[PDB]
Write a protein that holds these residues in place. Structure first.
Motif, PDB file in Angstrom:
ATOM      1  N   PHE A  24      46.771  33.119  46.048  1.00 18.54           N
ATOM      2  CA  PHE A  24      45.487  33.339  46.721  1.00 18.54           C
ATOM      3  C   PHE A  24      44.532  32.153  46.597  1.00 18.54           C
ATOM      4  O   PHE A  24      44.022  31.863  45.513  1.00 18.54           O
ATOM      5  N   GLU A  77      39.510  34.288  48.082  1.00 15.69           N
ATOM      6  CA  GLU A  77      39.495  35.634  47.523  1.00 15.69           C
ATOM      7  C   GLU A  77      38.084  36.239  47.604  1.00 15.69           C
ATOM      8  O   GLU A  77      37.247  35.971  46.741  1.00 15.69           O
ATOM      9  N   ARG A 115      41.843  41.467  44.996  1.00 15.05           N
ATOM     10  CA  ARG A 115      41.158  42.249  43.978  1.00 15.05           C
ATOM     11  C   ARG A 115      40.161  43.221  44.590  1.00 15.05           C
ATOM     12  O   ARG A 115      40.073  43.359  45.809  1.00 15.05           O
ATOM     13  N   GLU A 171      42.308  38.611  39.975  1.00 16.69           N
ATOM     14  CA  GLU A 171      43.740  38.631  40.236  1.00 16.69           C
ATOM     15  C   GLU A 171      44.325  37.229  40.286  1.00 16.69           C
ATOM     16  O   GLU A 171      43.695  36.286  40.767  1.00 16.69           O
ATOM     17  N   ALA A 172      45.547  37.118  39.781  1.00 15.60           N
ATOM     18  CA  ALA A 172      46.338  35.907  39.896  1.00 15.60           C
ATOM     19  C   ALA A 172      47.803  36.318  39.888  1.00 15.60           C
ATOM     20  O   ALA A 172      48.128  37.442  39.504  1.00 15.60           O
TER      21      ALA A 172
HETATM   22 ZN   LIG Z   1      42.924  35.991  42.590  1.00 12.90          ZN
END
Ligand SMILES: [Zn+2]
Ligand SMILES: *[C@@H]1O[C@H](CO)[C@@H](O[C@@H]2O[C@H](CO)[C@@H](O[C@@H]3O[C@H](CO[C@H]4O[C@H](CO)[C@@H](O)[C@H](O)[C@@H]4O)[C@@H](O)[C@H](O)[C@@H]3O)[C@H](O)[C@H]2NC(C)=O)[C@H](O)[C@H]1NC(C)=O
Ligand SMILES: *[C@@H]1O[C@H](CO)[C@@H](O[C@@H]2O[C@H](CO)[C@@H](O)[C@H](O)[C@H]2NC(C)=O)[C@H](O)[C@H]1NC(C)=O
Ligand SMILES: *[C@@H]1O[C@H](CO)[C@@H](O[C@@H]2O[C@H](CO)[C@@H](O)[C@H](O)[C@H]2NC(C)=O)[C@H](O)[C@H]1NC(C)=O
Ligand SMILES: *[C@@H]1O[C@H](CO)[C@@H](O)[C@H](O)[C@H]1NC(C)=O
Ligand SMILES: [Zn+2]
Ligand SMILES: [Zn+2]
Ligand SMILES: [Zn+2]
Ligand SMILES: [Zn+2]
Ligand SMILES: [Zn+2]
Lengths: 391, 387
Positions: free
Chosen positions: B6, B9, B94, B379-380
Motif C-alpha cells: 500500500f 492509504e 485499514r 496496516e502493512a
Molecule cells: Zn498500510
C-alpha cells in the motif's frame, strides 16, 4: 468499683448556623462517677470565650448564636472531644468535628440540557461547591404547575421520576415535553428555608438529523461515587444518541479482566440507563461498566462505587482483672466500612500499634488504667472503652 | 511479475457536511495492475447508490453533496475499506470510519459559575455532546469588548481545550458578563453564546474546607502526543488553598511530586502539559489543602501516538518446508491488539512474531499484520514466494 463507660457521645460531625447555635452533651458512668471535661482533639482543655464558647451548668459545651463578624475559626471550625475521668483512668470520645456556618445567600442554576428526541434525559440542579453539603433539592416544578416530589423508588414505572441523587429523570423525551420548563427548589438543612431556582431550565430537543455514535456528556471514561448503607444509591448513564440505544449494566469481578452482568430485582432497578441500588449494602461495592451500543457503534463507561457503613466498636472483655506478671490482652472488634486505622490508647495517651489485638506480656502496676481502641476512616471515627484491674 | 503493497492509504476517519461533499482515493502497487476494490468492513463488496455513493473512474470513491432528506445511513455513517489483488493475493486497507453531518444549528450555553473571592475559577461554555465532536471555542468575550485568545496578562487565560481560566477572582471580574464564540470545524460557521455567563462573587465569612465541583474522586483524560494537555482542578476554600499535583507509579501506592519547568507548567490548581510525549502517560493526583481541612482527587491520563507498522522482511522466498517468519514492528499508543490475516481471510494469532516452519502448497500468497485499537488502525504487508 468500675471505670468510666461512655453512654451518650456526640456525633463525628456537628453542623449548625450562627443564628441557631449548638449545645452538645457527653455522658459517662462508673464508680465513682466521672466528671466530663471538654477538650480539643490533641487533648488540650478548652475554656470560655464569652459570646462564642461557654461551658454551661452541667457538663455541656455551648455555642450561642453570634454575629457573622464575631465568627472565630478556632472556636467554630474545630476538632473536639469529650473526656470522662475518675480514680482509675481516663477516656476520650470520638473526634467531634464542629463546623458552624454563617448564613450565606445562595442561588441554584437549573441548566438547559440538550437532547435528541426519543432519548431519555436527566437534568441537574447546579449547586455551588460551598453549600452543596448543606443543601439539596426539595422538589421539582414545571411551568404547568405540576410538582414532582422526590421519592425512594418503589415504582420506577412512570414518565417522570425524581431520583434520590436529586435529579429529574424523563423517559424518551418528545415534543410534548419541549415547551415545558422546569424549576428545582432547594432546602438548607440547617435553616430549613426553601428557595426556587433563579434560572429556569428547558428541554432543547434536536431532531434525528443523522444517525451517529453514542455520546456521553463528558470525555470521562471513568468516575466514582460513594453512598451510605441504608441509602438508595443511583448510578448514571447520561449517554445520548440516535437511533436511541439500549443500556446494559455490568459489574467487574475483583482484580480481574472478567466482567459480569447486573441482576435486576425488586431491589435493584433500571430506568433508561439509570441503575438504582436502593436499600444498599456494603457488598454492592465494586467497579461497574455501563455499555451502550447502537446501530452506528458503541461506547462504555466505568464507575467505582464504595458503600460505607457506620463505624462501631466493642472491646472484649469490657473489663478484666489480672495479677502482676501475667499477660493481659485486649481485642478490639469493629464494624462499618471502610477501615483505615485501628489504634490503641491508654488513659488518654496513645500507644503506637495498628493491630486490633493489644497484648501486654508482663503486667505492671504501671499498666493499670483504662484502655481504648480507635477505629477510623477519613469521614468517621468511633470509641470503645475498657478497664484493666490488678490483684 | 511481483505482488502488491500500500502506497496511498486514506485517513482513518473522514468527516464532512451535506453541502461540502467529499472523495477518497486508494492505490497500491505491484504487477499486473492490481484490481482496486472498495469493500465495507465485512468483506462484502459495495456498489453504487448514485447521487451519494458511486465509484468514479480510476477506481476511486466520491461522495457528492446531497440534500438532508435523501440521507440514508448505510452509505453515510459507515466503515469502508479498500483492497488490491493480483495472482499474489489480497491486502486490506485499514479502518476508514466515515461520517456525514447535516446542520443542526448548534446552540451553546455559557454557564454561570459561583465563586468565593480569592479563588481561581474555570468558566465552561457547554457545547452539546453530539456536536462537540467538531465545534470548538476560538475566542471568549465580555461586556467590555475584551477579546481573549487561545494561548496554545498572566491572569486571564484560555486553554488548549478551550475553557477560560481566571485567577485571583476580584469584584472587578464578577459584575461583568461573559459569553463565548464557537466555530464548527467541518464548515467554518461561527456563532456566539446563546446565553451570558454571570460570575457570582460571594463574600467569604466563615472558613470553608476545600470542596470540588463534583463528588467524584476520579476522572479520565487523553490527547495526542504533540498536543498541549490540561488537567483540571476545581476547588474552592476559605482560606484559599494551595494545589500540589503529584504523580503515581504504575500499579503502586508510591508517589512523587512533579517537576515544574518549561514544558510542565502550573496555574492556580490547573496542571498544564505542553507538547507532550507518551512518557507523560500515567496516573496523577491533585491534592488541595488549607488551614481548616482539604482533600484530594486523582486524574488518569493517556497520550496517543500515531499507529503505524511494517513487516520484516517486506518480502522473501523459501524452499518448500523451510522456515519463514514475519515480525510486526509496532508503534503508536496505546496498542490494543495485533491481528494477522491471510489474503484478508481472518486467521488469529496474538503474537507480534508469527512463524511457519512447515509450508504447505496453498500458503503461496499475500500476508498482513493489522495493528488495531478502539478507534484507530494501521496496516502493512509481506509475502512469501515458493521456490
Ligand atoms: Zn498500510
Ligand atoms: C448570621 O450571619 C448573617 C449574615 O451572614 C446574619 O444575617 C444577615 O443580617 C443582616 C443584618 O443583621 C441582614 O441585612 C439586613 O437585611 C434586612 C432585610 O432582610 C434581608 O432579607 C434576606 C435575608 O434572608 C435577603 O434578601 C437580604 O439580605 C435582606 O437584607 C434589612 O432590613 C436590614 O436593614 C439589613 O440590611 C442580612 O440580609 C442577613 N443575611 C442573611 C440572613 O443571609 C444573621 O443575623 C447572623 N445571625 C446572628 C445571630 O448574628
Ligand atoms: C458494543 O461496543 C463495545 C465497544 O464500545 C464492544 O466491546 C468490545 O470492543 C472491543 C474494541 O472495540 C472489541 O475488541 C471487543 O471484542 C468487544 N467486545 C466483545 C465481547 O467482543 C461490544 O462488543 C459491542 N457490542 C455490540 C453488541 O455491539
Ligand atoms: C493535604 O491534604 C491531605 C488531605 O486531608 C492531608 O491529610 C493527608 O492526606 C493524605 C492523602 O493525600 C492521607 O494519606 C493522609 O493520611 C492524610 N493525613 C492526615 C494527617 O490527615 C495532608 O496533611 C495535607 N498536607 C499538608 C497539610 O501539608
Ligand atoms: C444541508 O442541510 C441543511 C438542513 O437545513 C440545509 O439547510 C442545506 O440547504 C443542506 N445543503 C444542501 C447543499 O442542500
Ligand atoms: Zn474525625
Ligand atoms: Zn448548561
Ligand atoms: Zn464511643
Ligand atoms: Zn476502526
Ligand atoms: Zn451551570
Amino acid at each position: 468499683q468500675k471505670g468510666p463507660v461512655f453512654l451518650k457521645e456526640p456525633t463525628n460531625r456537628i453542623d449548625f448556623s450562627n443564628s441557631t447555635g449548638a449545645e452538645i452533651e457527653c455522658k459517662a458512668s462508673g464508680n465513682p462517677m466521672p466528671e466530663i471535661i471538654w477538650i480539643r482533639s490533641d487533648g488540650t482543655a478548652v475554656g470560655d470565650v464569652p459570646g462564642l464558647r461557654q461551658i454551661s451548668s452541667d457538663g455541656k459545651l455551648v455555642f450561642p448564636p453570634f454575629r457573622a463578624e464575631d465568627y472565630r475559626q478556632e472556636v467554630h471550625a474545630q476538632v473536639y472531644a469529650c473526656l470522662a475521668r475518675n480514680q482509675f483512668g481516663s477516656i476520650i470520645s470520638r473526634d467531634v468535628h464542629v463546623r458552624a456556618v454563617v448564613i450565606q445567600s445562595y442561588e441554584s442554576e437549573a441548566d438547559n440540557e440538550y437532547v435528541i428526541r426519543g432519548n431519555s434525559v436527566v437534568m441537574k440542579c447546579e449547586i455551588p461547591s460551598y453549600v452543596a453539603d448543606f443543601v439539596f433539592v426539595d422538589l421539582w416544578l414545571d411551568s404547568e404547575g405540576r410538582n414532582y416530589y422526590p421519592n425512594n423508588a418503589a415504582e420506577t414505572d412512570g414518565k417522570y421520576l425524581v431520583l434520590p441523587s436529586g435529579e429529574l429523570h424523563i423517559r424518551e423525551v418528545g415534543p410534548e415535553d419541549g415547551y415545558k420548563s422546569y424549576q428545582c427548589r432547594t432546602k438548607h438543612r440547617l435553616t430549613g428555608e426553601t428557595r426556587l431556582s433563579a434560572t429556569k431550565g428547558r428541554l432543547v430537543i434536536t431532531e434525528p438529523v443523522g444517525s451517529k455514535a453514542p455520546t456521553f456528556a463528558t470525555a470521562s471514561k471513568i468516575s466514582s461515587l460513594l453512598g451510605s448503607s441504608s441509602s438508595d444509591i443511583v448510578l448514571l448513564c447520561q449517554a445520548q444518541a440516535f437511533p436511541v440505544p439500549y443500556t446494559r449494566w455490568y459489574k467487574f469481578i475483583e482484580g480481574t479482566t472478567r466482567k459480569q452482568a447486573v441482576v435486576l430485582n425488586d431491589r435493584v432497578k433500571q430506568v433508561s440507563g439509570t441503575l438504582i441500588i436502593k436499600d444498599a449494602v456494603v457488598e454492592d461495592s465494586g467497579k461497574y461498566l455501563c455499555v451502550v451500543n447502537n446501530s452506528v457503534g458503541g461506547e462504555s463507561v466505568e464507575t467505582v462505587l464504595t458503600v460505607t457503613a457506620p463505624l462501631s466498636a466493642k472491646i472484649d472483655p469490657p473489663t478484666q482483672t489480672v495479677d502482676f506478671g501475667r499477660p493481659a490482652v485486649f481485642t478490639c472488634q469493629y464494624t462499618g466500612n471502610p477501615i483505615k486505622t485501628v489504634s490503641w490508647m491508654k488513659d488518654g495517651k496513645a500507644i503506637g500499634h495498628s493491630e486490633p489485638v493489644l497484648r501486654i506480656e508482663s503486667v505492671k502496676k504501671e499498666d493499670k488504667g483504662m484502655y481504648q481502641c480507635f477505629v477510623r476512616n477519613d469521614q468517621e471515627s468511633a470509641e470503645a472503652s475498657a478497664e484493666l484491674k490488678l490483684g
